[PDB]
Design an enzyme around this catalytic site. Sequence first.
Site, mmCIF file in Angstrom:
data_model
loop_
_atom_site.group_PDB
_atom_site.id
_atom_site.type_symbol
_atom_site.label_atom_id
_atom_site.label_comp_id
_atom_site.label_asym_id
_atom_site.label_seq_id
_atom_site.Cartn_x
_atom_site.Cartn_y
_atom_site.Cartn_z
ATOM 1 N N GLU A 35 0.687 -1.167 -0.090
ATOM 2 C CA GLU A 35 -0.028 0.062 -0.035
ATOM 3 C C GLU A 35 0.831 1.173 -0.039
ATOM 4 O O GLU A 35 0.639 2.147 -0.938
ATOM 5 C CB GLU A 35 -0.817 -0.038 1.392
ATOM 6 C CG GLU A 35 -1.965 -1.061 1.219
ATOM 7 C CD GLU A 35 -2.999 -0.764 0.082
ATOM 8 O OE1 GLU A 35 -3.003 0.315 -0.500
ATOM 9 O OE2 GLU A 35 -4.022 -1.525 -0.034
ATOM 10 N N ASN A 46 -7.623 8.054 -6.071
ATOM 11 C CA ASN A 46 -8.825 6.855 -6.623
ATOM 12 C C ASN A 46 -9.624 7.627 -7.979
ATOM 13 O O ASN A 46 -9.661 8.582 -7.577
ATOM 14 C CB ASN A 46 -9.585 6.208 -5.604
ATOM 15 C CG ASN A 46 -9.119 5.809 -4.186
ATOM 16 O OD1 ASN A 46 -9.361 6.098 -3.202
ATOM 17 N ND2 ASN A 46 -8.021 4.967 -4.431
ATOM 18 N N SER A 50 -11.737 10.147 -4.547
ATOM 19 C CA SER A 50 -11.370 10.085 -3.063
ATOM 20 C C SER A 50 -9.891 10.064 -3.041
ATOM 21 O O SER A 50 -9.308 9.640 -4.040
ATOM 22 C CB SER A 50 -12.133 8.879 -2.353
ATOM 23 O OG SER A 50 -11.845 7.571 -3.129
ATOM 24 N N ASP A 52 -6.548 8.061 -0.797
ATOM 25 C CA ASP A 52 -5.989 7.208 0.310
ATOM 26 C C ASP A 52 -4.735 7.701 1.069
ATOM 27 O O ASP A 52 -3.994 8.309 0.321
ATOM 28 C CB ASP A 52 -5.718 5.755 -0.438
ATOM 29 C CG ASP A 52 -6.614 5.286 -1.493
ATOM 30 O OD1 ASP A 52 -7.685 5.203 -1.168
ATOM 31 O OD2 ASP A 52 -6.157 5.267 -2.736
ATOM 32 N N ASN A 59 -8.915 5.310 2.771
ATOM 33 C CA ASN A 59 -9.508 6.207 1.856
ATOM 34 C C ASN A 59 -10.840 7.125 2.625
ATOM 35 O O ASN A 59 -11.352 6.686 3.389
ATOM 36 C CB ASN A 59 -10.002 5.207 1.003
ATOM 37 C CG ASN A 59 -11.540 4.586 1.191
ATOM 38 O OD1 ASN A 59 -12.574 5.446 1.491
ATOM 39 N ND2 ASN A 59 -11.567 3.504 1.474
#
EC number: 3.2.1.17
Length: 129
Positions: A35, A46, A50, A52, A59
């Site tokens: 990640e 994203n 949104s 992260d 998120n």
Amino acid sequence: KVFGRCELAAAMKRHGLDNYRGYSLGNWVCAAKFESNFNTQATNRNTDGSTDYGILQINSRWWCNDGRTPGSRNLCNIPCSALLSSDITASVNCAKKIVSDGNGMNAWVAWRNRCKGTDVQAWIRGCRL
Ligand SMILES: [Cl-]
Ligand SMILES: [Cl-]
Ligand SMILES: [Cl-]
Ligand SMILES: [Cl-]
Ligand code: NA
Ligand code: NA
């Protein structure tokens, strides 16, 4: 802050992630590797607009407030920027809520696609815990 592999494993164990909801510690380290590469400052957009945030890429659609994700929720009741701190407490506590939300660690698509079904114990091999 960029954590070492075993340093992050130790911090996650201290915060109670080791076998939380049955996910052994290697699952959490593997997820963090893919990640964020263990970088607390990591941010990524994203397709839906949104963002992260942090070491576990939590998120803004559901879990934190960044002031710029229309129609979103803030289920961890935190500003997203808190998830970028060198102290991973907020990320861990929010992660505990996420993983308890019904889908387990499948909520992290990188966990499903890169860690699930692999030998995740390898990620903590050699670490003094
Ligand atoms: Cl590594
Ligand atoms: Cl496990
Ligand atoms: Cl910490
Ligand atoms: Cl589960
Ligand atoms: Na493990
Ligand atoms: Na939000």
